């Protein structure tokens, strides 16, 4: 069953931006309803935990700028696994998240902190979301080769040979 | 999807249907001497205008020589005076007993709202027609008058030349 | 970065050769056939080298992660960013291999091994045929 | 309730003004290949006269369909140039629409 | 007239082929410019130089996806498919030429 | 520009067409 690749997949939510608008405060809230947000990530678990509790270079800059991002670490350091964190922000139109997974290897002999490993690239441009360059290059080259093949077969069709002259047109 | 699908009846009408439409409508008119869709060719027949002359869309309804206003003027003047007086009384309320200030605020707004109503009956398309009327009228009068001015000055120059050549004879 | 640098220089020379063959085809008069053959063969073998080198360094290209510059403004150059971002193939090639697969259309595996044995048999047969007659 | 064919055809005509909609529609092969769609486009031409023209919301599509009318004898090819050409020719086309209506 | 038509067709075809190929160079020229400015300056087009100061492409690391039977076997059998295709058009083109 | 005001655009709104009854009419085209 034909599936559109998620790298080119682009979601638009006019109702959400009309109701709430685009801001770093609710950029994760905007991302929550997208298909790219896995329901198995610990961010959703933290979300239900918060809901239950209520019912009952630029990395350091964005680190020190917002306190909710602080709360994100102090709620995310306890849970290791696939997590969604912000990468960088330039207002009022550009935001990009950092898709990384954490394995808090607390074993004896490792003086390093929890291991952070990239998984995917996500770019929020306007109200749209974008998600390999190797594929782009090979696709461009192969389409170029197809066009070249068509041109060369047409040119060879145009070619006419005679023994007494050689090849002419 | 983002783009809604084309209407369904669009695909029913081929070139053969278009060329057989005249005989089809002739037969339909002969037989006739919400429209039920008994044949695929019914849609090309122009749709009838609704008897109520109304159209509903998105929750909203839709449907001669240009082809006591003093009462409204004095009502507007007295309403403006009363609005200024009520503004003074409301700011005095804010001064002495602001706790109930809102009790007058919306009241003043009602008068302002009434002002908007007083604009609705005064609505201006005819006035725009008038102003455009005089601007092109005066422009064409200016063009005309400069035309007879220039032709008259040319004629005067010709007569002066004729007199000059007659004197040289 | 070294692998992408080599890819850059080789693709740049390939684009230069493409510009060349372009501005010698754009002339109203067609040059001699032989010059066209030389240009074709050179550019086409250069494309082969491009493919081979891109094959060699897939790991370095894959490991790299794309990210826009902090200094690069997206508000004014969003069109330029989207131009390079998009990667979907041209449609005509798409329905091209769709019709190709339509025409082509444990059983598949044993046909695959039957193709293996036909390939090996044909290779051995032509080796024998070449050995039959002295070509030196 | 179910809307009448008046409403859906009017909404289709007014949505034809969108450049994104036109680009998407022309992107698919079978939409332009099928004569049914162009037959419907020529059928839609009769809305340029009153009182039908009084019921329109955006007059720009009035030319666009007419421009789309030209597309049947100009070729698909030119789909790529559509946004650039509409952006460039918006001024004079708006001026001619104003001349057709405002005068 | 058919010669003119086919010449125009092959011109526009090669132009379409090269338009996509240019963007590959435009992307790949950024890394050296980021690493070494002076060498990288000449690589980009003047318009791209005007667009931004070039430091665009920086090295980064991502792990390789864990392998399994799922995708290589299908990748290679489908490559078998396209090369059987290429063999078919090879035979057809050779037959027409002969 | 940043405040999306309803029912006043130069061009027809995509959200207006999404909220328009033509969407469900196409969805309910079988019922037609």
């Amino acid at each position: 069953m034909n599936v559109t690749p998620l790298d080119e997949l682009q979601w638009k939510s006019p109702e959400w931006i009309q109701v709430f608008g685009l801001r770093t405060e609710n950029v994760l809230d905007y991302f929550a309803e997208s298909p790219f947000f896995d329901k198995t990530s610990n961010n959703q678990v933290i979300k239900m935990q918060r809901q239950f509790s209520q019912l009952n270079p630029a990395r350091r800059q964005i680190l020190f700028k917002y306190p909710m991002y602080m709360q994100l670490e102090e709620e995310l350091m306890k849970l290791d696994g696939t997590e969604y964190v912000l990468s960088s922000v330039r207002e009022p139109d550009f935001w990009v998240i950092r898709k990384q997974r954490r394995t808090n290897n607390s074993g004896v002999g490792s003086a390093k902190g929890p291991e952070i490993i990239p998984l995917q690239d996500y770019y929020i441009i306007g109200a749209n979301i974008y998600q390999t360059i190797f594929k782009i290059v090979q696709s461009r080259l192969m389409s170029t080769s197809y066009h070249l093949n068509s041109t060369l077969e047409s040119l060879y069709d145009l070619i006419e040979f005679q023994p007494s002259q050689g090849v002419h047109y | 999807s983002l783009y809604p699908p084309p209407p369904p009846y669009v695909k029913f009408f081929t070139q053969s249907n278009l060329e057989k439409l005249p005989k089809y409508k002739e037969k339909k008119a002969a037989s006739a001497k919400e429209e039920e869709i008994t044949c695929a060719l019914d849609y090309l027949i122009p749709p009838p205008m609704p008897k109520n002359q109304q159209y509903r869309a998105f929750g909203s309804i839709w449907q001669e020589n240009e082809s006591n206003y003093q009462y409204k003027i004095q009502e507007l003047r007295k309403l403006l005076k009363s609005l200024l007086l009520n503004y003074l009384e409301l700011i005095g309320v804010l001064s002495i007993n602001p706790d109930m200030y809102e009790r007058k605020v919306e009241n003043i707004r009602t008068i302002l709202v009434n002002i908007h109503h007083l604009l609705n009956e005064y609505r201006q398309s005819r006035e725009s027609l008038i102003m455009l009327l005089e601007e092109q009228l005066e422009y064409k009068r200016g063009e005309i008058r400069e035309i007879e001015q220039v032709c008259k000055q040319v004629h005067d120059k010709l007569t002066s030349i004729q007199d000059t050549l007659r004197t040289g004879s | 970065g070294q692998a992408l640098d080599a890819v850059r220089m080789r693709l740049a020379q390939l684009t230069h050769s493409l510009r060349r063959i372009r501005d010698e085809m754009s002339k109203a008069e067609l040059p001699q056939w032989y010059t066209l053959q030389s240009q074709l063969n050179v550019t086409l073998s250069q494309l082969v080298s491009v493919t081979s080198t891109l094959q060699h360094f897939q790991e370095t290209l894959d490991s790299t992660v794309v990210y826009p510059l902090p200094k690069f403004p997206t508000t004014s150059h969003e069109s330029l960013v989207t131009t390079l971002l998009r990667k979907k193939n041209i449609p005509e090639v798409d329905e091209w291999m769709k019709y190709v697969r339509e025409t082509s259309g444990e059983e598949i595996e044993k046909l695959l091994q039957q193709d293996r044995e036909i390939t090996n048999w044909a290779r051995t047969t032509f080796r024998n045929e070449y050995g039959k007659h002295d070509f030196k | 309730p179910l809307p009448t064919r008046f409403e859906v055809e009017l909404e289709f005509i007014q949505s034809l003004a969108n450049i994104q909609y036109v680009t998407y529609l022309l992107t698919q092969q079978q939409i332009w290949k099928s004569p049914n769609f162009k037959n419907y486009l020529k059928y839609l031409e009769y809305w340029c006269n009153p009182p039908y023209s009084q019921c329109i919301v955006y007059p720009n599509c009035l030319f666009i369909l007419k421009l789309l009318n030209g597309f049947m004898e100009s070729a698909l090819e030119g789909l790529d140039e559509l946004p650039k050409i509409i952006q460039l020719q918006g001024p004079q086309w708006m001026n001619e629409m104003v001349e057709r209506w405002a005068n | 007239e058919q010669f003119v038509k086919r010449r125009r067709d092959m011109l526009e075809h090669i132009n379409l082929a090269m338009n996509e190929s240019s963007l590959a160079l435009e992307f790949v020229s950024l890394l050296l410019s980021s690493v070494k400015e002076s060498t990288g300056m000449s690589s980009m087009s003047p318009f791209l130089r005007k667009v931004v100061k070039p430091s665009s492409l920086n090295s980064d690391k991502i792990p390789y996806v864990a392998p399994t039977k799922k995708e290589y076997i299908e990748l290679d059998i489908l490559n078998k498919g396209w090369k059987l295709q290429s063999l078919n058009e090879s035979k057809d083109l050779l037959r027409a030429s002969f | 520009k940043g405040a999306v005001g309803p029912n006043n655009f130069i061009w027809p709104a995509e959200d207006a067409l999404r909220r328009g009854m033509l969407a469900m009419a196409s969805l309910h085209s079988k019922e037609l």
Partner: peptide, 25 residues
């Protein structure tokens, strides 16, 4: 040095083929 730089071969007129589909909520 560098014999000749490459001519700008940008194609902004290219319409692109981005698939758009997950717009409905």
């Amino acid at each position: 040095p560098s014999y000749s730089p490459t001519s700008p071969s940008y194609s902004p007129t290219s319409p692109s083929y981005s698939p758009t589909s997950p717009s409905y909520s």
